[PDB]
Write a protein that binds this ligand. Sequence first.
Ligand SMILES: *[C@@H](CC(=O)OCC)[C@H](C[C@@H]1CCNC1=O)NC(=O)[C@H](Cc1ccccc1)NC(=O)OC(C)(C)C
Ligand SMILES: *[C@@H](CC(=O)OCC)[C@H](C[C@@H]1CCNC1=O)NC(=O)[C@H](Cc1ccccc1)NC(=O)OC(C)(C)C
Lengths: 306, 306
Amino acid sequence: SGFRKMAFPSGKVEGCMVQVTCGTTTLNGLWLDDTVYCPRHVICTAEDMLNPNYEDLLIRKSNHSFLVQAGNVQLRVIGHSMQNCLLRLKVDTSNPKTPKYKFVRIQPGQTFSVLACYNGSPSGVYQCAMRPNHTIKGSFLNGSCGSVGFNIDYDCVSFCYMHHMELPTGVHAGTDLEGKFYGPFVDRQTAQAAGTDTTITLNVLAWLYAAVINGDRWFLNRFTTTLNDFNLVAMKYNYEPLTQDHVDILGPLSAQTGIAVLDMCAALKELLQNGMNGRTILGSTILEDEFTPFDVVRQCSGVTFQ
Amino acid sequence: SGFRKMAFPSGKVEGCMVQVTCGTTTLNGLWLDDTVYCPRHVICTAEDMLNPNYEDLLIRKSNHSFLVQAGNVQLRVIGHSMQNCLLRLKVDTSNPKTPKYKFVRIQPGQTFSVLACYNGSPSGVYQCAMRPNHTIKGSFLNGSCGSVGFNIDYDCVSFCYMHHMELPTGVHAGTDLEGKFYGPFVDRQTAQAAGTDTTITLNVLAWLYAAVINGDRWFLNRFTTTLNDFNLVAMKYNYEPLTQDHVDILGPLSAQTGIAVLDMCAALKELLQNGMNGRTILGSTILEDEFTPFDVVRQCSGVTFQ
Ligand SMILES: *[C@@H](CC(=O)OCC)[C@H](C[C@@H]1CCNC1=O)NC(=O)[C@H](Cc1ccccc1)NC(=O)OC(C)(C)C
Ligand SMILES: *[C@@H](CC(=O)OCC)[C@H](C[C@@H]1CCNC1=O)NC(=O)[C@H](Cc1ccccc1)NC(=O)OC(C)(C)C
């Protein structure tokens, strides 16, 4: 029993973290096989960030403009290319600790583990959701650029995020491992701001299922709703509209608890309208939206506490 | 910026997890040098748990009564002893991935990372506090016994918890790595229940400091309090009494924010009495008590956002 924000074990990723230096700028990089990935802004000074031309900045560098350090060992750079907002540095050595891996672009609402790193040294690990507005509510200080986000399935690491910047509201933005930003953000100094965010309806519903599987039914009611009537309420409280696809995704959790999705929606509609009347759900006084249906199935018992 | 429940990177611990089988019972064990640690209840059947005599159960076993599997490799047991509520199994091979390590008994209020494991295979990682009542609010299913809790300082792993059981309220109990239980619990089937718990005052105060360092001052006030007057309020709301030692511990956070401890206490007293008036602190609508002053210094900037 219990329910916690749980990250994937971080060891396969720790063995891939290195330090990348260009001039006086140091950040983190990711070393797989004979390649090191890092944010391209490693080539900028502070004044560069105000109007950088990356093609122009990069052509001015040689292979030996870059130092890469893995633990106490210097790797020698033998090639370099830009790919969108990342650099791909080729090095003299293949990483002996390279795990089976893939590069994946995750979708808003999905979750992943972040390994916070400084000077190529991992310091901590926590679970984040990709928000509808394409930011994450992370925890990052100076030196954290190039920290990665990932999921693990079987023994394969699916890398999905590399960290690049902080926005004025204190939330975080970055790219996938092809160097393409999540959201409309750019790696240069502008007046960019996070767009208005929304609550992830599917996840809140998944988490209510988790609460039932764990033994709590206090918030259920005798009612049902149509998809359309639910959404009118959803719009008023700044929740994402629920779709038939979201309804089908919740199929297995529905089957395990014997609670129809539209009946769970009626329960959520009542919580939105009346509040929680001083009560908690899985330890929480608010409606949680950072666990997916996959996260709930991974963590909860396959047997409901009836 | 940001503030998250952050666990230590788990890799050094993943390389120490093995599977231990006795008869039809399988659980996790911890392999350091040439020794494997695991809960002694691995030697019981279900009916045994109702009245087990462990000395009597153990003398009936040989070295080869135990199988230990590390990945795909069988380790051969060449000796065994009981130590309080753990078994210490000696094996044919020293763990090549043994990190620098210590065994430490943590104190109530302190935090650690848990690596949830099943069949010797790590599945997830999250941060817990040792509660005043000597339980943790973990997340554990069948097969999780022998999962460990730990902290990391520099490159040394300080092991502090091994998991043994779940209590009727759904919280968790276990031992240090000498096999001594945290709390008055025993590894046999009784009517044992978690004692009444208390909120960890020092941690709530640390977390308010974290909120100031991160840039928020909304909950401060013009008042001060004496230690004794604070505690009268503390008792009414089921918070631990604050001591001069707790006041001295908060010295560095106080210095970094320019907020005297007793002034922060007056702020907390007002929050207890008036609630939060619909507002949040570091994203939270309630007062959080699972971050220590050490946790705040580790995660937050050393420079206050004034
Ligand atoms: C990674 C690199 C770094 O630390 O540079 C300092 C010498 C930075 C990580 C940031 C820092 C605090 N949290 C966090 O997530 N990223 C940055 O500093 C970016 C660089 C950048 C500037 C302009 C456009 C894109 C990227 N800057 C940044 O995040 O701005 C602040 C912190 C001022 C809001
Ligand atoms: C580890 C061993 C196990 O899974 O045995 C099942 C064949 C168990 C971990 C528990 C299970 C659910 N969550 C969790 O933390 N521990 C136990 O099953 C203990 C064994 C025990 C019994 C009596 C006294 C001490 C230890 N039993 C247990 O936790 O009881 C329940 C789950 C019924 C409350």
